[model samples]
Target chain A: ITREPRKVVLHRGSTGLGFNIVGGEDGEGIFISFILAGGPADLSGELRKGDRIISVNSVDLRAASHEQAAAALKNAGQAVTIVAQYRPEEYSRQHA
Target chain B: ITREPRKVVLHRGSTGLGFNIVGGEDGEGIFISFILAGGPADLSGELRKGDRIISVNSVDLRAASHEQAAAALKNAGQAVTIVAQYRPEEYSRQHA
Candidate 1:
């Protein structure tokens, strides 16, 4: 299969929390998905199934697919900008 | 299959017409694809192969998936705004 980012629109919250961006911003309908098994995305970064994808490169995924808006990332390497919305339980607790 | 939108960029027309939004506007190497069977797209819509997808909702699909960019249309229902660059002949009957 052609290695590519299959975009996703989060329509539900992995958790009931408002900030649980696991699916999208507030889980209010954000796009989320994973890289194809053999696509051109960064091969390393603990890619997950429901990981929230905040942004790609510098473009806001609020209105685009990881592929449609991944031009910059594809062209440039090293780091692909991504801000995510995930479940609270998914992250380790911060210092008290 | 999960009813979700997939991103597509038009890059060519089915008939090679100037306005034929088949693959994308002007065939400039845009993204393109079809609705997954059993998905939530307009079922009656004449979903075809190599169709141009201009836009989704009020947002310009210059850089988005038919999915990530299909939110507005998903909620609004009835219609999915798509401005495509398809081939000529694809449209039948002209006022000329």
Candidate 2:
């Protein structure tokens, strides 16, 4: 029933959901730029490159800075739940 | 002059290219299932989720096992070069 990748909670251990992110459009929120292999993030099978994370846990990220988003992940205290979204056309050309 | 993301060489330091892989179709080779943030791999800005690595450092991956592929990355000697590909149809559903 969801148009986006389902929300996922990633723990801090076991490969960890390896990723790098940047603050995206104020409208677009935080975009995940990269992911680490074998990490919890990878294992979750829910995150992706080009995916936009709109929130951390219940916190909205619409106005958050890249540093704030990073802090959200850090403050998650060993676990974080992310609400994610993606735009097909936007990533299609990059992958192909 | 190139259709795919250019080949990327990731060193073993600086967040590292975080990722997870599973042996894919014998013909398809190894598929990248996950990536880590802040790693060299992520920094390269070339790799992506769902990317199929047909070869590593010019070594073909056809018929290689997940273990073998993992070994290849390990033995890459501080830096590894990856030849990558992506299929739009396969990943479209997962992301959207």
Among the numbered candidates, top TM-score falls to: 2
lDDT of 2 by residue, B18-38 (tens): 664543323335666556565
Model 1 TM-score, 2 decimals: 0.26
Recovered share of real interface contacts in candidate 2: 0.03
Query: Could you report the DockQ of all the candidates, in the order they appear?
Result: 0.03, 0.06
Candidate 2 off by > 4 Å: A14-16, A25-27, A90-96, B1-96
Superposed model 1: Cα runs more than 4 Å off: A1-30, A38-45, A64-72, A76-78, A87-96, B1-96
Give lDDT per model, in order. 0.32, 0.61
Q: What DockQ would candidate 1 receive versus the native complex?
A: 0.03
In order of listing, the candidates' clash counts read: 35, 25
For model 1, give the RMSD to the true fold. Answer: 17.1
